[PDB]
């Protein structure tokens, strides 16, 4: 007989095409539903466990399937029958299959009830941690956090003992997995038990021979510090952080640096003032560029979170000279990392401190060769603007940013455009016309379309600020000149400018100055300009006076809706509907 689903119809699908095997595994629910649940537990699952396959994708799909097999196996009561096949998957050489198997195991952990967790899952964890192969030992690390909260105290002490043994194992990757899972595992433990069991082994992990285990130890250091009471961190976490920050390997010091802000938040401000600021100092003054860049991006977050009473003293006494040396760093990545956060110190330091100390540092970074530095500096100009006002901005930073309106990289010019409304809103018509109006016009003819779009959108805000008479005197003539340009990009740019300008220029200006220019472009040879004319007439329809619609706009749209280009037809007829 060849109709038993269990052996037959499955082991015949071992063909060369892997996708058929994944399809069989993907539809393993249907075969299981066909079988009786008792028959499934008796025959299907032992077949899966005993047999061993050698294709990573099928194994991954099989592990993913077993996480949702609780309904098709007999409910949560019999869910322990899923433990052998996933155990077999947890011992494979491939790491991804192991992680998926551990995920499925901890997903079916919830299905078990406390008694079944103690009866079946905890022996499984013991077997995995006690296995001959290290792969099972690393697999056992991720299983502790889900079995721990819902077991008896003796079993919890046992779990602590096996995690401690696993951490202190001679095998490196087992220690790596244990250190990685230490943060999650220590989350649920009792605090006194954390101090007694986790902390000594954590300190042992930080002092290990290998460097990857130390890196993962410092990773877990943040969570471990966060868990503990503040009265205990001087003797428990802080010596470990001191050890780690001075480690020979730059990877450990780096990942200390990225985690520094969370350490600051966890341990409380007085401990940071006393002990963290030399660690931050020699992280910024460190030899390696990676750790210097990692520390630089944390300067703003670190300084903002200190106690205000002793904050500025810390900043100028310890942080600021290190910043001064980082601004002239040889590596451009360090300078870029510093640039993205340096303006955040302006409200913290105050106005006079910013002018005397921070402003030369901004100016030095605004003239850097590296584009990333220049881009990161400008993006946070609103902060320094609000701090020092605009008189100091015009005195110090305005000539530097005007030089950056012609930058080689267009994202710098985009930042400058994005920061023009602020300046406009804080400066008069006369000064803006003297200095910056030509800059606003220079961008409309830029090569990059994003620059032209940003400048067009910026014109709307500029007209909103300085009124429409200023627009008629300074904005409109230079926009209309672009309509006669031989490049169709510039004609389309005027159509976009008219799109954003009709809204703010009012009925009269739109009717008599902008509309006749829009209508004469219907005879353009480029179809793109023609259907953008149709789009513009659709868009400036509401803000035109209603008298010139049927007389002037409608004949042009009627001429366009019979045009030869299909896109011109479509946009002309869409405009015709919208005009109603």
């Amino acid at each position: 007989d060849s109709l038993y689903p269990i052996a037959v119809l499955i082991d015949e699908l071992r063909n060369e095409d892997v996708q058929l095997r994944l399809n069989s595994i993907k539809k393993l629910s249907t075969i299981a539903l066909a079988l009786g649940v008792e028959r499934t537990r008796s025959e299907l699952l032992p077949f899966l466990t005993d047999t061993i396959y050698d294709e990573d994708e099928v194994l991954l799909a099989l592990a993913e399937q077993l996480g949702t097999f609780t309904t098709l196996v007999g409910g949560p009561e019999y869910v322990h029958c899923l433990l052998p096949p996933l155990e077999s998957l947890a011992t494979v050489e491939e790491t991804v299959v192991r992680d998926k198997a551990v995920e499925s195991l901890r997903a079916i952990s919830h299905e078990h009830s406390p008694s079944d967790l103690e009866a079946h899952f905890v022996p499984l964890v013991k077997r995995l941690a006690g296995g001959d192969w290290f792969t099972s030992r690393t697999s056992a690390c991720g299983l502790f956090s889900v079995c721990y909260p819902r077991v008896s105290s003796a079993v919890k002490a046992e779990l602590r003992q096996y995690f401690r043994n696993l951490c202190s194992d001679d095998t490196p990757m087992v220690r790596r997995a244990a250190a990685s899972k230490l943060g999650e595992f220590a989350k649920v433990l009792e605090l006194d038990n954390v101090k007694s069991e986790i902390i000594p082994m954590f300190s042992n992990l930080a002092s290990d021979e290998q460097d990857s285990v130390r890196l993962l130890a410092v990773e877990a250091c943040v969570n471990i510090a966060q868990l503990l009471p503040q009265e205990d961190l001087e003797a428990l976490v802080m010596p470990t952080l001191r050890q780690a920050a001075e480690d020979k390997s730059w990877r450990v010091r780096y990942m200390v640096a990225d985690k520094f802000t969370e350490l600051q938040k966890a341990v409380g401000p007085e401990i940071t003032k006393t002990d963290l600021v030399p660690a931050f100092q020699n992280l910024m003054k460190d030899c390696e560029a990676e750790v210097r860049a990692a520390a630089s991006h944390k300067v703003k977050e670190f300084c903002e979170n200190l106690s205000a009473d002793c904050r500025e003293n810390v900043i100028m006494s310890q942080i600021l000279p290190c910043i001064k040396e980082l601004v002239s760093d040889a590596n451009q990545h360090v300078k870029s990392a510093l640039a993205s956060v340096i303006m955040g110190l302006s409200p913290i330091l105050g106005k006079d401190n910013t002018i005397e100390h921070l402003l030369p540092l901004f100016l030095a970074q605004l003239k850097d060769e590296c584009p990333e530095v220049r881009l990161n500096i400008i993006s946070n100009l609103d902060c320094v603007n609000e701090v020092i006002g605009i008189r100091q901005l015009s005195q110090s930073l305005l000539p530097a940013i005007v030089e950056l309106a012609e930058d080689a990289k267009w994202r710098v010019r985009l930042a400058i455009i994005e920061y023009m409304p602020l300046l406009a809103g804080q400066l008069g018509v006369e000064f803006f016309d003297e200095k910056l109006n030509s800059l606003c016009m220079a961008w409309l003819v830029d090569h990059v379309y994003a620059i032209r779009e940003a400048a067009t959108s910026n014109l709307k805000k500029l007209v909103e600020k300085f009124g429409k008479e200023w627009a008629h005197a300074t904005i409109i003539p230079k926009v209309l000149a672009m309509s006669g340009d031989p490049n169709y990009l510039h004609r389309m740019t005027t159509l976009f400018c008219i799109n954003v300008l009709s809204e703010v220029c009012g009925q009269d200006i739109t009717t008599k100055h902008m509309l006749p220019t829009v209508l004469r472009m219907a005879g353009d040879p480029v179809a793109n300009v023609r259907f953008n004319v149709a789009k513009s007439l659709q868009k400036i329809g509401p803000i035109l006076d209603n008298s010139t619609l049927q007389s002037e706009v409608k004949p042009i749209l009627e001429k366009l809706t019979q045009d030869q280009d299909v896109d011109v037809k479509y946009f002309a007829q869409e405009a015709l509907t919208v005009l109603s």
Binding site: Y449, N487, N528
Partner: protein, 290 residues
């Protein structure tokens, strides 16, 4: 039908793929649109010429930010939209959607990677499997790749193309006479148009690749003179500066994939041709990825 296409384009601009049925209907429409196109498509003068994209979707978004949005900017893509990139599916789907929506504003040519073998080997097939679970989307796109025109002809002067020239092809009438509805062969006139490269040599040569030829300046000079061309626009080769003039301005290579395999660190350029065939190359750097 057009509203749904616009919705797909808006969705695809955010790097969210379409469903299998959507891809099937899109490729049906694209097949019925690409049947009518000649092997040598005729493109009007105001157009932006782009080289390989190779599935770098965010670099394609940077390209659109540089040159402009379709349909406002006419675009000519010279093949190689898939492989060597993480978002080949989204890239090719967006380009096909733009072709279906804006027929006269988009020209998509066939690259050498628009073939069943190259897609199977170099990750478009794998990407399709990962993002859909079955090869049906890959089937639809590879069947659609057979429909792509081999070359374009801007203004009758500039001969856009992916690979290069062939010893067996002397005229554009030969290219117009080819049957492009087939998998790209390993040898023959159609292979060279997608696989050949220029070289600083004399005459023809064996390509370092397994296909195509490598041709010197005299070849492109004779081709341009015999066919009344002023320029052979091109793709298919990494350019560190994004574009490079070759053969005394007879050939120009354009590469529109900055940081090509996410490791080459190259620039990317696009040739913007205005109404009067006045060109300008817009070099651009890879986009900032989150």
């Amino acid at each position: 039908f057009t509203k749904e296409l616009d919705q797909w384009i808006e969705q695809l601009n955010e790097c969210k793929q379409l469903s299998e049925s959507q891809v099937k209907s899109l490729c049906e429409k694209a097949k019925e649109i690409l049947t009518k196109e000649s092997n040598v498509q005729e493109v009007r003068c105001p157009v932006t010429v782009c080289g390989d994209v190779h599935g770098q979707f965010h670099d394609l978004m940077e390209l659109f930010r540089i040159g402009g949005k379709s349909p406002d900017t006419n675009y000519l893509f010279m093949g190689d939209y898939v492989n060597r990139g993480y978002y080949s599916v989204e890239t090719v789907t967006l380009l096909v959607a733009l072709k279906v929506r804006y027929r006269e504003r988009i020209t998509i040519l066939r690259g050498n990677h628009e073939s069943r073998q190259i897609t199977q080997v170099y990750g478009f097939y794998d990407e399709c499997l990962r993002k859909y679970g079955n090869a049906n989307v890959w089937k639809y796109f590879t069947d659609l790749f057979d429909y792509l025109p081999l070359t374009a002809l801007v203004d009758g002067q500039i001969f856009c193309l992916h690979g290069g020239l062939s010893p067996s092809i002397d005229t554009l009438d030969h290219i117009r006479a080819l049957d492009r509805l087939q998998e790209v062969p390993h040898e023959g006139p159609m292979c060279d148009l997608l696989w050949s490269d220029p070289d600083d040599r004399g005459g023809w040569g064996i390509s370092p690749r397994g296909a195509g030829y490598t041709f010197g300046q005299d070849i492109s000079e004779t081709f341009n003179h015999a066919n009344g061309l002023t320029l052979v626009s091109r793709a298919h080769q990494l350019v560190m500066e994004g574009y490079n003039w070759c053969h005394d301005r007879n050939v120009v290579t354009i590469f529109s994939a900055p940081n090509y395999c996410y490791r080459c660190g190259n620039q990317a350029a696009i040739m913007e041709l205005d109404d009067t065939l006045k060109y300008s190359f817009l070099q651009f750097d890879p986009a900032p990825r989150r």
